[PDB]
Structures are given as C-alpha cells and as structure tokens.
Amino acid sequence: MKKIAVFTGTRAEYGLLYWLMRDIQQDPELELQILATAMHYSPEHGETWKTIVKDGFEITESVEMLLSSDTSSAVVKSMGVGLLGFADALKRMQPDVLVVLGDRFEALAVTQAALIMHVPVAHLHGGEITEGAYDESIRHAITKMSNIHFAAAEEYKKRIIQLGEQPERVFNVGALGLDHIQRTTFKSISELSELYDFDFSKPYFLITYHPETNLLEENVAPLFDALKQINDVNFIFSYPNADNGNTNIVKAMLDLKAQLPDRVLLVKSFGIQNYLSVLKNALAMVGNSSSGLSEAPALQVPTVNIGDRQKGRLRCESILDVRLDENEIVEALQKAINFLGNTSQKIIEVIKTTDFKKKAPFYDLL
C-alpha cells in the first residue's frame, strides 16, 4: 500500500490541501501520512494543528520549528530547526511520496530534506510568479528538487517545463483549493455572526496583509490610514504569516482595533470553511494574499491587491492592483463599495499511475 505523506506548515495551505488529504484518507489503497510543522504549532498564529485533528486527521509527525524573534536571521534558524526535526520525522515515516504545496521557507526545508533522503516530492503550485517575496525564488528551487509537478494553469505548466522538468512529469490539474467551491458547504451570515460575536450583516472588507519580504523598509501605515478613512464599513482581519516583518503588521492591526473596537474583528485564523464563508460575503478581499488572486475571483468577490507580493500571477478584471499608498488604497476601496472541481481526483490518479521514483533528467528546450 502506497504511503502518501502530506506536508503542511500553515492553516491556509492546510485548507488548500484539505480535499486531497480527505480523499487519500478515504481511499482504501492509499495510506495518508501528515507531517505538520511551522505555523500550526505557534500560539501567535492560532495553534492551528488543533484544526487538523478536529477535522478527523491523524498528525503522523509534528515538528515545532519557529523561533519567536521577528528577524530574517531567526527565519533561517527556524529552517535549521525544521531540517533537524524533518531528518528524524522522514526517517520514521518512510513515505513513498511527499506532497508539498507552494513556496514558503518551511516548504523549502522539507523539500531538500526529502531530496537528500531520496523521498520523491510531488510539488503543487509551481510555475507561478510572485516577484515581491523571496517565496518567488523558493518556489523555483522547490520545483528543481521535486520529481513530479501539479500546476494550476497551462502558463504555469509551461514555466515548469522551461525550468527543465520533463514534460511527462508536469500536469496542469488546476488549483486544488478551488475544489472547496463544489465540495464544501458555506456558512450563512447568521451562523458567522453567532460564531464570531460580530454582525456580518453589515458591509465589511476582509483584509489579509503579509510582509512583502523583498521590500526593504516596509511601512504598512498607508493601508491602515486608508481603512480609517472609510465610513460605515467593518474591517475583518486574518493574521499575517510567520515571515520576518509580521509583528509590525500585528501591531498596526491591534492599534486599529483599539481605535475602532466595534468595527474591527481580528481572527488569528479562520477554519477554511469559515474563511471561505467570510470571504464570500465580503465587499472585497483587501491586502496581498494569494486568496485575492484565486478564491476571491472564484467567489466573484472584488480584490484590492496591494504592492508586489502577488506580482506576476495571472490577472482578471475583478483584480484592482494598487501601490502601498494611502490615496490609491482609499480610492480602490471606494470602487469596491460603489460597484473544474475535481483537482484532488486528478492528482490521485496521476500519483497512482505514474512512476516518479527517480528525478528525471534535465529537459533542454530544443
């Protein structure tokens, strides 16, 4: 029986992975393993490992790794703690494949761990471009260390091939997180209001702003000063991720809460069912998260995308791109006030029927 290990280091990536994990678990010919780490064990990010367990999954191996110091040197140390724990976790699990989604620093660490230990990596969401984050270069490094590739669009598949991956190892299966659109039940406004003790019947923005890590001196005051200028709208926040630079954003969020206690809801981390439900009923998805470029258009919610963290990803008409600039942000906010489904199944099929035990040779473009 094939042991498919799924890596997860953040609530949001766990949300994207959910239906693959559920289907592997339900499949009698496959044994799900889970390696959970990074933000799932940090109290500052909600201790979201508890959500994995409550959803009915068994965490095969957990590795706590994040240092609390908010610095780039501490991020590198965290990656080192991660490698030290992954060494023993992968030794014990002995997975037949490790599924790795995305582009975060903990994903880079587990991928090179798996490579060194000859565990084949299946990589989801390669081939994409996010110029303003060091996730950009991480993503392509993870591609180069992975044996098989599940891309979300033909453009992205083509880039993975340009990177020198064999065409027969690259699969355009779509965006796995978008299977939630068909398979997950959404909560109503009344249910959200009871759950968060907050009136979701009043218009609101959903805001997620993460550190833009290639930006030298990030000052997020233009965003919060912009929000303070909008009247008769509530502000619902999720917390920034664990990249260096995030405590500055948390401070700004707490300050806004203190100034507007009845108009601000700070949620360390929504379950992705609740998250998608809150997103669906928002005036707009504000900030610089990838959900603004995927889930928000898919739910027909406008996106106010700020800065360069998402720069290079495919665009569409509902995306308002603006600089980290108070006047540009205010005006985009006002604009928003005034105006297929079987990816999991496809991935499992490929994994069941494809030999990707050995990294294929480099693919030169003739």
Residue positions in the annotated binding site for N-acetyl-D-glucosamine?
125, 128, 139, 290, 313
245-250 long-range contacts (CB < 8 A, ≥24 apart) are: 245/70, 245/211, 245/212, 245/213, 245/218, 246/70, 246/210, 246/211, 247/70, 248/70, 248/211, 248/218, 248/220, 249/209, 249/210, 249/211, 249/220, 250/44
Binding-site partner at residue 27 among Li ion, a second copy, none, CB < 5 to 8 Å by type: Li ion
| Binding-site sequence positions | 11, 125, 128, 139, 210, 270-271, 275, 290-291, 295, 309-310, 313
Binding-site partner at residue 30 among Li ion, a second copy, none, CB < 5 to 8 Å by type: Li ion
Please identify which residue in 6, 9, 14, 27 interacts with Li ion, judged by CB under 5 A: 27
> Smaller CB distance to a second copy: residue 73 or 182?
73
Minimum CB separation of residue 8 from Li ion in Å reads 17
Contact 343, 161 (CB under 8 A): no
Binders of Li ion among residues 274 to 293 (CB under 5 A) are none
Q: Which residues bind a second copy (CB under 8 A)?
A: 72-77, 79-84, 86-88, 90-91, 105, 108, 112-113, 115-118, 129, 131, 133-134, 136-138, 140-145, 159, 162-164, 214, 244, 312, 358-359, 361-362, 364-365
Count Cα atoms within 13 angstroms, Cβ side, for 23. 18
- Number of shown-chain residues binding Li ion (CB under 5 A): 4
Per-residue tokens: 307: 């800065």
Minimum CB separation of residue 182 from Li ion in Å reads 20
Among residues 277, 313, 77, which one has the least CA distance to residue 189? 277
Q: Are strands 121-124 and 97-101 parallel, antiparallel or unpaired?
A: parallel
Q: How many CB atoms lie within 10 A of CB 165?
A: 26
Binding-site partner at residue 358 among a second copy, Li ion, none, CB < 5 to 8 Å by type: a second copy
Distance between CA atoms of 347 and 149, rounded to whole angstroms? 10
Q: How many CB atoms lie within 10 A of CB 204?
A: 21
DSSP state of 39: G
Contact 25, 39 (CB under 8 A): no
Distance between CA atoms of 248 and 251, rounded to whole angstroms? 5
Per-residue tokens: 64: 């706590």
Collapse the DSSP code of 135 into the 3-class scheme (helix H, G, I; strand E, B; otherwise coil) and give the result. Answer: helix
Minimum CB separation of residue 140 from a second copy in Å reads 4
> Smaller CB distance to a second copy: residue 340 or 365?
365
> Smaller CB distance to Li ion: residue 257 or 346?
346
Distance between CA atoms of 225 and 257, rounded to whole angstroms? 13
Which residues, including other chains, have CB under 8 Å from residue 293's CB and lie 6 or more apart?
Answer: 303, 305, 310, 313, 314, 315, 319
> Smaller CB distance to a second copy: residue 193 or 214?
214
Minimum CB separation of residue 65 from a second copy in Å reads 10
> Smaller CB distance to Li ion: residue 24 or 279?
24
Binding-site partner at residue 80 among a second copy, Li ion, none, CB < 5 to 8 Å by type: a second copy
Please identify which residue in 30, 153, 266, 337 interacts with Li ion, judged by CB under 5 A: 30
> Smaller CB distance to a second copy: residue 164 or 203?
164
Minimum CB separation of residue 60 from Li ion in Å reads 13
Binding-site partner at residue 254 among Li ion, a second copy, none, CB < 5 to 8 Å by type: none
Minimum CB separation of residue 362 from a second copy in Å reads 5
Minimum CB separation of residue 267 from a second copy in Å reads 28
Contact 13, 19 (CB under 8 A): no
348 lines the binding site for Li ion (CB under 5 A): no
Sheet containing 204-208: which strands, arranged edge to edge? 264-267, 234-238, 204-208, 285-287, 303-306, 319-322
Minimum CB separation of residue 178 from Li ion in Å reads 22
> Which positions lie near Li ion, rule CB under 5 A?
24-25, 27, 30
